[PDB]
From Swiss-Prot, chains B, I:
The chain holds residues 44 to 121 of 151 of the full protein. The gene is zraP. Induction: Expression is induced by indole. Expression is regulated by the ZraSR two-component system. Keywords: Periplasm, Signal, Stress response, Zinc. It comes from Salmonella typhimurium (strain LT2 / SGSC1412 / ATCC 700720). Belongs to the ZraP family. Forms oligomers. Stabilization of high-order structures requires zinc. This is Signaling pathway modulator ZraP. It comes from the Bacteria. Part of the Zra signaling pathway, an envelope stress response (ESR) system composed of the periplasmic accessory protein ZraP, the histidine kinase ZraS and the transcriptional regulator ZraR. The ZraPSR system contributes to antibiotic resistance and is important for membrane integrity in the presence of membrane-targeting biocides. ZraP acts as a modulator which has both a regulatory and a chaperone function. The zinc-bound form of ZraP modulates the response of the ZraPSR system by inhibiting the expression of the zra genes, probably by interacting with ZraS. GO terms for cellular component: periplasmic space.
Curated annotation (Swiss-Prot), chains G, H:
The chain holds residues 45 to 122 of 151 of the full protein. It is found in: Periplasm. The keyword Signal applies. The gene is zraP. Induction: Expression is induced by indole. Expression is regulated by the ZraSR two-component system. One of its GO terms (molecular function) is zinc ion binding. Its main location: periplasm. Part of the Zra signaling pathway, an envelope stress response (ESR) system composed of the periplasmic accessory protein ZraP, the histidine kinase ZraS and the transcriptional regulator ZraR. The ZraPSR system contributes to antibiotic resistance and is important for membrane integrity in the presence of membrane-targeting biocides. ZraP acts as a modulator which has both a regulatory and a chaperone function. The zinc-bound form of ZraP modulates the response of the ZraPSR system by inhibiting the expression of the zra genes, probably by interacting with ZraS. This is Signaling pathway modulator ZraP. Forms oligomers. Stabilization of high-order structures requires zinc. Chaperone activity is enhanced by zinc and inhibited in the presence of EDTA. Disruption phenotype: Mutation does not affect growth or survival rate, but mutant is significantly more sensitive to polymyxin B. Keywords: Periplasm, Signal, Stress response, Zinc. It comes from Salmonella typhimurium (strain LT2 / SGSC1412 / ATCC 700720). GO terms for cellular component: periplasmic space. Belongs to the ZraP family.
């Protein structure tokens, strides 16, 4: 279980994370689609595939920084 | 449940699956684009609608084969 | 991920969609049952099965257009995935 | 569990599924027709009521066999 | 789906559950009885066939009521 | 798990199921019966209570058997 | 019915207060039974003794369960 | 893997084999523990006595689970 | 089952979690740590062992507290 | 199909050229959680581990695309 206070604090932490990361998540989701789109073309274009793969690597690293930032906040706050 | 029939079903399915693998793959590829376009930062409605019309025709061709399959079965008495 | 505001716009876009396609979805279901009836009939009738396949195809084409309007609406409101 | 019982449990069920397959197929077919009608733009109680009768009849004929198998099965001393 | 459609279906089903409490309950009793007989040490065919006929009948009464229900739903325009 | 244990376990369970098949099928026939009775329109305390006593009796004998096999399992060193 | 719901509450309510002690006691003897069956060196006299205690407890409780079941039927509830 | 899948059974078998007796007592001691909690009047001293008995058995099981986890990792298994 | 009881049990359990919170967090941390060591490229037995023990302790303290709760519950008549 | 072979060849190799990576990434992940669940987090140690996790994952995805691409050229769905 969790306290009223703990939940409150955790709710703000996650809300910020979501808000601060919205565009990023949506761009990543959009890029996997494109990735999958390309992999399933009739005649696969390896160049485009790799380019889209690298875009995903870039977005993904940014997104991990935000999560870690959020994890550390949670731990500093003393939450489970 | 019969051997005669059993061999009738798989033959229709395999003909169905073999006569449609390209379309299916193309339909899947196209849903991925559709979703990609929908999730872009500035959705391009013209592009999105064009891709939906492609899906619509691919899917029309598929359903057509699906009805053949279904009707081959009814006729096989299976 | 969705905020109070976003939950509501999405909900409204979906209700609108349900309401507008309501009779169209019912008809589509009715044809799907009829089709299955035909396929399971004691002695199968290809003409009827085919004619019913077409009615379904046309109804489904109308339904999908409505879904595209809906998905596009959603995208235009900035609502995630 | 015993041999002569398994022999009788198979012959009992196999017979039933053979004696039963046309009836189940017709009944399934009408279950669909009945639903197709109940979902028609404007409901037609006559055909709906009619189809419903076709189903009862098919079901009575189907339970009549259900009983028959259950009885054989009990006379054979099986659970 | 719609709140008013949900309210309307609820009344239709409630009316049905009330108009049939006694049949349901009776059919359930005959169901149990039927199995009590089938699992007797010495199964009594005649007695079982008679229970089947009582269930057959309760069953049709029940069905007609279902059709009323289904038609009533179709009539309210509930999916 | 072990081999000489599986044989022993399998043998004990089979005697149990054989020495109790008829008793077990009878208890089932009475649970169905009890329920049929509890579910009639006009309930009959007398028969209900009669059947309850027959189940208490069958169950006593049956539990007596289960303990007989739990001891066997335990005496053989099985989990 | 309204009346229906209430009486059952009392019926079921009477039943629970008339068996809290037995229920608990049988749960305990069943734990004890299993304890003995799983002992390093099983004592079949001890095991049988507990099986007898369970039998009594069970009988007394099944006897209440019928009283309960009879009440309900008499009060016309499923 | 395949050749390493064998190598795992071997390590688990030993673990299962060496811990049978412990595991069974732990199970029995846990049943008495519960039989005691559900006694008509819970006896604190006895309950704590059984609990300490579970500690030990527990510590002895853990102590073998660790030899196992270690045997695995050294076998270089996932 | 009773409201009054429900409240008592909820209260006994609230106490338990509140009081074992830091302890539960330390055990979770150590389990992770332990798994980290197991999956190291070249496993280190001394430190794995060292961690097994640290978990052993925390685990015993945690069990003492589970027993206290079970007894609490026991005497409260729940 | 008659191509389920190539699919395995392409996956097995993916796996073999990856085992050490996946395992080290699992270890680092465990180490990451062990640190977040400490009573008071050491944000320095946590960040260093997140970086270790970040490269491993980047190396691993690179192999995964290689693998996906292969499948695509094998004409395998």
């Amino acid at each position: 279980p969790l306290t009223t206070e703990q939940q409150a604090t955790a709710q703000k932490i996650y809300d910020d994370y979501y808000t601060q990361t919205s565009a990023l998540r949506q761009q990543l989701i959009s890029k996997r689609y494109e990735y999958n789109a390309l992999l399933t073309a009739s005649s696969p274009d390896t160049a485009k595939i790799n380019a889209v793969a690298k875009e995903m690597e870039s977005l993904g690293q940014k997104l991990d920084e935000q999560r870690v930032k959020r994890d550390v906040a949670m731990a500093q706050a003393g939450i489970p």
